[PDB]
Amino acid sequence: LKDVNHIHPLPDFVRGGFDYVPSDIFSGKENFEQTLRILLERLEFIDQKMVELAELRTTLNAEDAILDEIGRQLGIYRNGLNDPEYRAVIMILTGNNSKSGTRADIIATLKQLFGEDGVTTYKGYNYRLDINIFNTCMEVTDILPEIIDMLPLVTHLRVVENQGY
Amino acid sequence: QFKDLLLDPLTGDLDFGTPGDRGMRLALTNQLSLRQRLYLRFAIWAGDWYFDETFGFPYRTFVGKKTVKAVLDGRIKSEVRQEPDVLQITDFQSTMDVVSRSYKCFFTVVTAEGEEISLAFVGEDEYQYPTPPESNVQLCGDEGVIINFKNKLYYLINFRLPK
Numbered sequence: 001l002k003d004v005n006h007i008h009p010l011p012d013f014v015r016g017g018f019d020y021v022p023s024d025i026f027s028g029k030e031n032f033e034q035t036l037r038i039l040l041e042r043l044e045f046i047d048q049k050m051v052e053l054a055e056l057r058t059t060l061n062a063e064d065a066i067l068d069e070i071g072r073q074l075g076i077y078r079n080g081l082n083d084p085e086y087r088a089v090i091m092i093l094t095g096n097n098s099k100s101g102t103r104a105d106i107i108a109t110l111k112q113l114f115g116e117d118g119v120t121t122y123k124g125y126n127y128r129l130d131i132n133i134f135n136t137c138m139e140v141t142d143i144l145p146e147i148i149d150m151l152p153l154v155t156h157l158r159v160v161e162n163q164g165y
Numbered sequence: 166q167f168k169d170l171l172l173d174p175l176t177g178d179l180d181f182g183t184p185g186d187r188g189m190r191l192a193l194t195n196q197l198s199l200r201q202r203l204y205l206r207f208a209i210w211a212g213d214w215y216f217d218e219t220f221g222f223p224y225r226t227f228v229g230k231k232t233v234k235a236v237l238d239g240r241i242k243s244e245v246r247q248e249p250d251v252l253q254i255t256d257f258q259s260t261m262d263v264v265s266r267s268y269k270c271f272f273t274v275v276t277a278e279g280e281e282i283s284l285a286f287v288g289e290d291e292y293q294y295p296t297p298p299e300s301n302v303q304l305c306g307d308e309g310v311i312i313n314f315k316n317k318l319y320y321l322i323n324f325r326l327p328k
Contacts, residue, residue, distance in 0.1 A: 022214040022221070025205070031178030
């Protein structure tokens with residue numbers, strides 16, 4: 001019924017405070033109101049930017065200019081990656097820390113990179129595993145090094161990518 | 166002498182001034198300060214201003230109720246004397262009309278005027294520091310000593326001859 005995240009712009013900030021004019025003594029004088037409005041409306045701008053200072057620092061929306069700072073703390077350097085996929089690698093490596101490389105587990109990680117039906121996985125008798133891609137939205141060669149990391153120590157892997165079925 | 170932002174007696178907004186000298190002004194004369202100090206004290210209904218529940222006048226007690234004129238006048242006349250710089254109240258014409266149910270009183274208040282104690286915070290200074298001399302006047306004299314003497318001689322020559 002209520003949002004748990006209380007960090008939001010204050011609703012109707014301006015009309016508040018004006019509500020503290022005692023008994024409409026000054027209201028309708030058009031000389032005191034403008035002086036008060038001009039000062040209060042400055043806080044509006046500062047109040048608004050208080051959110052982006054917290055909202056924009058999250059990894060989901062962080063821009064490349066500062067996303068590097070988030071990656072730097074985790075040891076994931078930009079190298080030659082671009083912004084749209086640099087976000088992906090950060091998620092992939094971080095998610096690897098609570099993984100076991102099971103068949104059900106592997107499907108889950110690939111799920112975040114290719115939608116619901118964009119990926120499928122065949123399995124083979126002698127350590128063979130196969131990955132199929134149908135709806136890639138980013139160039140895969142640069143993402144490939146991580147795709148190896150979350151697999152068992154002895155996996156034998158093939159990678160094939162195509163658009164659609 | 167209580168300083169504060171000047172309130173226009175005619176409109177109630179801040180007295181930004183005439184179109185030729187628009188700006189902001191402070192209440193300096195004790196008369197102007199006391200005027201607005203009474204105006205605000207009477208205009209704010211008791212309890213309606215947050216941050217101070219005890220300020221204001223309790224109009225709700227009288228308005229809308231059958232009340233005695235004499236009781237109201239006492240309270241009206243008492244709130245005025247809460248200011249520490251009120252000398253006296255001269256006259257009080259309290260009248261009530263039963264047809265329209267309106268009440269309207271008249272009175273005036275007398276207050277003296279004080280001094281400014283210090284001008285450090287307001288505008289100007291009262292001293293007359295000297296002016297440095299010009300050119301070689303200091304080390305060699307001044308010509309004005311000649312001009313004044315010449316003028317004195319001329320005026321004395323003028324005086325003796327009858328006119």
